Design a protein around this ligand. Structure first.
Ligand SMILES: CCCCCCCCCCCCC/C=C/[C@H](O)[C@H](N)CO
Ligand SMILES: CCCCCCCCCCCCC/C=C/[C@H](O)[C@H](N)CO
Lengths: 191, 271, 37, 246, 271, 246, 37
């Protein structure tokens, strides 16, 4: 089931506006818009979702993922975007021509504007432990970046800033194993 | 439709599409339906026969583990009572509150330890008191004659006691969230102390004593672990992200609301 | 699965249907087709 | 069933909700080279996944006083990924392409873009000089722009002495900001030789040219981005040797 | 071809050879193949029906013996952890390092003794912590609620505990030798502290405590014996002849290299 | 019909007139990965001509006081040709090998060479230190020598604490200067995982070790060269992304 | 071989092929014949 990812989890953010990716008109081309890691058992945008809180009860996950982008903006504002998933290796790409070398989808703003980038299962081993960081950087899954294909064009008398809602879910290839405990709850004494 | 599964789903080979009108990428999230774009319509993929087992993610395998339901202190009044509610500890309460309705059996286990920790060869009586039955008022009262209540005699040097409990609710299922009032009449605006109290979940009292006529000089803690079995669930709901404050109420803190995702430098830096 | 008791709740213990949570819509939407005309 | 579309190649996809039809250059589909037309003896390689996907180039700015842009397509993907590595290590190359151009706008903007391919698009040298040993010739960055493109000087003659009015004989589309926000052209391998090098020879070239300028009212978004995403369908390489860049 | 065997091979009668061209004695060791000269072509032999059993030399019969995998000290912090690696002792490590790949199950046994040696009637909790699970930080912390981790309660006066462990690797086999780096990037020339560390062999932590709320005043050693079963082996390699120095690394001594055959007087004296 | 031999792979050939038999490691032929053992979803690439041929490394000198040499084979071909480019751009790798070692001599020289492979050949660190956080570990150029090889320090224990007398359990041959002037070993893909990276993990490693030293009389040619020519049979690559060297 | 558990790894437990270690050569060599001609 799709569930809103908290990609805007940075500081200087209010309560609910952490769920929105701001999009606005640029001046230089090819500019980057957003980026986040794919590991669901890792701290970040995959922690506000529902597949991230269920795969935290299990130790080893498998299968392909899915990220759905919905555009909340004006009806007269158009544009395009390039969502690119990059397998492990180097760090976050610095350019758009670097990101196009991975697995990308070009999505335009039209009558539907509800695109869905699939994240295929590209791993060496069958499973991946839901514990990353330090000596566990062997189970990272890659980076999902969001760039600007052309621009966010907009006519006069129309707001010049809109939002994207990113949601995340699993596929029919999803599999979970070895039940462990979660680390979101803490208790000193009995309630 | 209802489909069975012995393993996860397989993948079929795919080629390049070059045609108009066939768009498996554009969805509609406003319609309240999950996207259905699969791998065979997104990227060129190969064929794999996925034989990964999905058997240990069902409700029965997820809930059939003995957690901790209640610690009962007997720092010897002569006896110790314990209202039966499984919301005391925040480890099993979260998993149970992942769902709205649950119908299951129980398997209680009683692990009793001493002050520092020990097993002195004494005798202990655990008695279940259903709603309406008389609660014992002393360590040698007549309520401990248990002519009709289920009671268990065990020693501290014995293995931990274990019983199996059926579905004892008057309703058809246990509900962890109840939007209503048990009584009638005018309800106050200041303090609703009865809001969200389902009377179909109160199951009775659990009493424990040391079988004696004098007063044994020991203090002891008895731990009650529950393993759910034959479990059925209905109406799944989200998992709690705020810290717990009370047992029977989903209270949280107005100020100091913890965010469900830790902070990073900026939105344009995935590191 | 052997039970030693008269009551069946003292004994010892692959259905999936995600189409009631993922796509609980009245009008069925196709895979390759656009969702709204 | 005609304006919404999705094109998936390799591991990349392209969705569009308003568009024109998909053009097919000269009615021929790009396929592998048969054993009749082939002449090289050594066996070619076919990655078919790593090199046949959507490579996105950088974005060009769409303003009021623009002139146009042109690319040389077997030369733009010589630094990007496994396709560039194979085109550097190998010596012979043959593939078809699929070119998508996204330029979206609102319902208050107006303009027109002519997007077309020209097989063997030769750049001319501007200057009145009839002596062959002194006339001005274009530079290497003018003939082979690369992954960064190059702008026109005279879009009225295509920088080749050929009127762009008659440029509709080529495979082409129009990006009209009130009908479609993108254009797509699938091109086979058009050449007089079965295999050819993808380093010192560019088969064709795209040209986006502003026919009707971009106009809008005060308050609307000013800078209109233009993006081009391309896909080398049915790639074949041959003659593996040491790697050369140019 | 694959041949079965209930016993060792038999011998057939042989006579004297007097002919040219038939030479079963001249081999070629440069071809990388073992000599195949049998007894029937070397010396005149008789016929014997050899019924000696070769059944107890297989991999299953060679590895299915409980050795010693790890001693855990609890000289009571209140608890004791132990990273699970079977390379601590040089008795089973050698047999395991006779092969390159092994896929097997495990059967752990826990034998716990006191300072001098004793069995005081206390209680002990052994808990397995998978990679990623929270390690207990105290003797009464919440990580000991084991709502999902496998835990074992046993007394010191009980028989030694025993469990069976499946194949828990993400890869298809355990490899005792890994020629590579787990991470990426630039690797140093001075000290490669990560060379030869296979991440598919790290299996988690084993914690142990005394179930109490006060602090019991005893120090105790718990020994973890493993018996391999259902074992399969791949790519046999030579057996180590140098003394061991480290656990996760095959380090030896540059100077003072021990010879694999003791010295004698001369080569012409077999005594 | 047993000593003369020719092995042709891709566009390369290897002829020999005196040799031993061709060894096949563990009786298994290197073939492509089946759909049962495979786990990655994306389709692999198979050049099958440009990457499956004979790559020749440099020549090592054969003197009187030599000790031996070792290579890490998925790491020696990471800078040579289309195989190196594919192993840098891609992320998963699987192939078998075929290793020929030429060391010819006259009928008046004598010596012996043990040439063998070791799957997961781990280099040990020499030094008596039982503290784990201070013990000496080998450098990056000692663990991964590359296309230039590395010499031993103690060939008696294979620089791993393992006696080289028992190194005959591995697939091996002998270069005896009076019987053969070369050795050949075909090796399948021996690993506990179907695909693995060809950058930070070397499957196996060859070791040429002088067992019987090189001896001759005054007047004979002194410096005896040693050459190794290898062939990655049945190569498969996967996971195309940005190029990384190490 | 009786098992009392749902999982098969908790249960209780003559193939030989030396021709892949002794003679892993391509061209098969005979017993009575010389190895190399
Ligand atoms: C002393 C030996 C027998 C002990 C009998 C105790 C069992 C009777 C209580 C049944 C427990 C049912 C499970 C929990 C019920 C409700 O959901 C809780 N009140 C939750 O608030
Ligand atoms: C507390 C009762 C249950 C105890 C559970 C412990 C079993 C989990 C560990 C499995 C051990 C697998 C065998 C050894 C694994 C690797 O080969 C070693 N790390 C070798 O380095």
């Amino acid at each position: 089931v799709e569930t809103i990812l908290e990609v805007n989890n940075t500081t200087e953010a209010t309560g609910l506006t952490r769920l929105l990716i701001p999009v606005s008109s640029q001046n230089k081309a090819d500019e980057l818009c957003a980026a986040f890691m794919v590991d669901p058992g890792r701290i970040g945008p995959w922690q506000s979702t529902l597949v991230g809180q269920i795969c935290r009860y299990y130790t080893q996950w498998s299968g392909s993922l899915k990220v759905t982008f919905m555009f909340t903006g004006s009806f007269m504002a158009t544009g395009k975007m390039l969502v690119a998933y990059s397998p492990p290796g180097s760090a976050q790409p610095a350019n758009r021509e670097t990101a196009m070398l991975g697995t990308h989808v070009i999505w335009d703003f039209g009558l539907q504007s509800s695109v869905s980038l699939v994240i295929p299962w590209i791993s060496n081993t069958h499973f991946r432990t839901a514990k990353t960081g330090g000596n566990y950087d062997y189970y990272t899954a890659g980076v999902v970046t969001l760039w600007y294909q052309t621009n966010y064009v907009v006519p006069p008398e129309t707001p010049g800033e809109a939002y994207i809602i990113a949601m995340g879910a699993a596929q029919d290839n999803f599999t979970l194993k070895i039940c462990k405990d979660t680390d979101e709850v803490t208790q000193q004494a009995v309630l | 439709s209802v489909t069975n599964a012995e393993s996860a789903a397989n993948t079929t080979p795919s080629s390049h599409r070059l045609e108009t009108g066939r768009v498996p990428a554009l969805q509609a999230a406003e319609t309240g339906a999950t996207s259905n774009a699969t791998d065979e319509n997104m990227i060129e993929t190969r064929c794999v026969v996925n034989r990964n087992g999905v058997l240990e993610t069902t409700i029965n395998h997820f809930f059939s583990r003995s957690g901790l339901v209640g610690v009962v202190n007997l720092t010897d009044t002569g006896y110790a009572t314990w209202d039966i509610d499984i919301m005391g500890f925040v480890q099993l309460r979260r998993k149970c509150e992942m769902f709205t309705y649950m119908r299951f059996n129980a398997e209680f286990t009683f692990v009793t330890t001493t002050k520092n920790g020990e097993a002195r060869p004494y005798m202990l009586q655990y008695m279940y008191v259903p709603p309406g039955a008389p609660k014992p008022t002393g360590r040698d009262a007549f309520q401990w004659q248990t002519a009709t209540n289920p009671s268990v005699f065990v020693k501290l040097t014995d293995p931990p006691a274990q019983v199996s409990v059926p579905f004892m609710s008057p309703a058809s299922a246990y509900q962890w969230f109840y939007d209503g009032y048990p009584t009638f009449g005018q309800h106050p605006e200041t303090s609703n102390t009865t809001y969200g109290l389902c009377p179909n979940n109160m199951m009775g009292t659990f009493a424990v004593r040391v079988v004696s006529r004098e007063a044994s000089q020991l203090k002891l803690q008895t731990r009650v672990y529950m393993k759910l079995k034959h479990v059925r669930a209905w109406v799944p709901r989200p998992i709690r992200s705020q810290p717990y404050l009370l047992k029977n109420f989903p209270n949280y803190d107005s100020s100091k609301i913890t965010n469900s995702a830790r902070d990073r430098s900026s939105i344009k830096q995935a590191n | 699965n052997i039970n030693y008791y008269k009551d069946s709740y003292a004994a010892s213990a692959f259905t999936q249907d995600p189409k009631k949570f993922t796509q609980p819509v009245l009008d069925s939407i196709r895979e390759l087709s656009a969702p709204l005309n | 069933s005609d304006r919404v579309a999705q094109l998936t190649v390799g591991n990349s996809s392209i969705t569009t909700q308003e568009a024109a039809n998909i053009v097919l250059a000269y009615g021929e589909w790009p396929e592998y080279c048969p054993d009749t037309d082939a002449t090289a003896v050594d066996k070619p390689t076919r990655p078919d996944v790593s090199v046949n996907r959507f490579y996105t180039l950088d974005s060009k700015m769409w303003q009021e006083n623009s002139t146009g842009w042109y690319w040389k397509f077997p030369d733009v993907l010589n630094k990007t990924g496994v396709f560039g590595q194979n085109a550097q290590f190998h010596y012979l190359y043959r593939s078809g392409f699929c070119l998508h151009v996204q330029c979206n706008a609102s319902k208050f903007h107006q303009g027109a873009l002519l997007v077309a391919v020209i097989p063997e698009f030769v750049i001319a040298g501007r200057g009145s000089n009839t002596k062959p040993n002194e006339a001005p010739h274009p530079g290497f960055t003018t003939t082979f722009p690369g992954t960064t493109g190059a702008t026109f000087h005279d879009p009225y003659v295509l920088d080749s002495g050929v009127p762009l009015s008659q440029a509709l004989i080529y495979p082409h589309q129009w990006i009209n900001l009130r009908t479609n926000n993108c254009a797509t052209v699938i091109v086979p391998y058009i050449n007089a030789v079965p295999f050819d090098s993808a380093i010192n020879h560019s088969n064709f070239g795209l040209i986006v040219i502003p026919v009707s300028p971009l106009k809008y009212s005060s308050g609307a978004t000013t800078a209109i981005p233009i993006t081009i995403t391309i896909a080398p369908l049915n790639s074949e390489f041959g003659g593996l040797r040491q790697a050369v860049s140019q």
